Amino acid sequence: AMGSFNSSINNIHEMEIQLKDALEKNQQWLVYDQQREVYVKGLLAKIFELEKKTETAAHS
Amino acid sequence: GAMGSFNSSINNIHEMEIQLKDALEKNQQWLVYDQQREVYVKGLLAKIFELEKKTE
């Protein structure tokens, strides 16, 4: 019975599905990171602008 | 073949496995890293809300 060996073969097949799926995910994180940093900076910009006589920046 | 290709093929599958484990780790790191950025974001939004009461 290679039935035990055969099953091992597709677990390997599955392993390279899950691998392929992890890398696609990891790629999604990279773009998501790029989008979130833009978001944080915009929020920071809002605060900066909003800071009306409660704080002060650009100070030598 | 026997000495063989097969052997190299087996190693090649082993690299695939450690590469899977690596990716799964790095994705988990991203999750935590992102959760913390969300904490920062929520704080930023709380700050903006407060700051916007003085604009009123």
Binding site: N26, E37, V40 | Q29, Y33, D34
Partner: peptide, 13 residues
């Protein structure tokens, strides 16, 4: 070529 975060803890820009 999988990549993790720049560092384990988040540091704002």
């Amino acid at each position: 070529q999988a990549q993790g975060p720049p560092y384990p803890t988040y540091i704002p820009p």
